[PDB]
Amino acid sequence: TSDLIPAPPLSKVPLQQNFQDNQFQGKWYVVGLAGNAILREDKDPQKMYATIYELKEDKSYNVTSVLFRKKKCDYWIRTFVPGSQPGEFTLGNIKSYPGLTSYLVRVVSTNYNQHAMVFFKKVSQNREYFKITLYGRTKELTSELKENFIRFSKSLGLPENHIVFPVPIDQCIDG
Ligand SMILES: O=C(N[C@@H](CO)C(=O)O)c1cccc(O)c1O
Ligand SMILES: O=C(O)c1cccc(O)c1O
Ligand SMILES: O=C(O)c1cccc(O)c1O
Ligand code: NA
């Protein structure tokens, strides 16, 4: 059994105009996490992790997430293949992910040098998951940018306790 808030129609998820894939390269800090499978948990509040976007020759991203767990750095690697329009992506080598039938990425907004919002949607074991990452070039962002991320997360149907801001750490995500 699993109950999920439904994934929003793509109509409610903006696309960043004139997406410069080269300027989106590099390290982003996950300053905000929201989604139908994300839950606030004050026992072990979630530690901040980072995701690095590196373009290849074929303009796909090698996407490496690095995070700190069990006293070690875990490295989660996958490829984002360019999608229907610039700033939109799909997951490469989907068959290597057991249960995974669908994966969409959409860069909602960014200024490239400070902040970014990315929308993800996946269907795994037939369950439709979606999430929104508040990307920060640094570990801290303005309260306006954070409130806008709360604003946008709610516009897609998520309640407050499904919107989390991971606490900054220094292990692994530097550098
Ligand atoms: O909600 C997600 N994942 C949770 C459970 O699958 C998680 O926290 O791992 C989730 C949703 C869209 C895309 C993803 O990469 C993703 O991990
Ligand atoms: O499980 C996670 O926390 C996670 C981290 C980075 C990237 C992902 O897709 C994840 O599901
Ligand atoms: O949990 C996973 O293994 C997973 C698989 C495919 C894509 C993801 O984002 C994942 O977190
Ligand atoms: Na991420």
* CATH architecture tag: Beta Barrel
CATH superfamily: Calycin beta-barrel core domain
Helix/strand order: HEEEEEEEEHE
Number of domains: 1
The strand order across the widest sheet is 1-2-3-4-5-6-7-8
Total DSSP E strands:
9
CATH fold name: Lipocalin
Radius of gyration: 15 Å
Structural class: mainly beta
- How many helical stretches? 2
Strand content: 35-45%
Level of helix content? under 10%
Question: For the report, how would you describe the main beta sheet?
Answer: 8 strands, antiparallel, barrel
Alpha-carbon distance between the termini? 40 Å
Hetero compounds: 2-(2,3-dihydroxy-benzoylamino)-3-hydroxy-propionic acid, 2,3-dihydroxy-benzoic acid, sodium ion
- CATH top level? Mainly Beta
Spatial shape: globular
Written overview of the protein:
- With 175 residues, the protein is mainly β.
- It has a single domain, classed as Lipocalin (Beta Barrel), CATH 2.40.128.20.
- It has helices at 21-24, 143-155, and strands spanning 26-35, 50-55, 61-69, 72-82, 88-91, 100-110, 115-124, 127-136, 163-164.
- The protein has an eight-stranded antiparallel beta barrel.
- Strand 2 (50-55) and strand 3 form a beta hairpin.
- The chain is globular, with a radius of gyration of 15 Å.
- One 2,3-dihydroxy-benzoic acid binds at residues 65, 76.
- Keywords: Apoptosis, Cytoplasmic vesicle, Disulfide bond, Glycoprotein, Immunity, Innate immunity, Ion transport, Iron, Iron transport, Pyrrolidone carboxylic acid, Secreted, Signal, Transport.
- Disulfide bonds join 73-172.
- It is found in: Secreted; Cytoplasmic granule lumen; Cytoplasmic vesicle lumen.
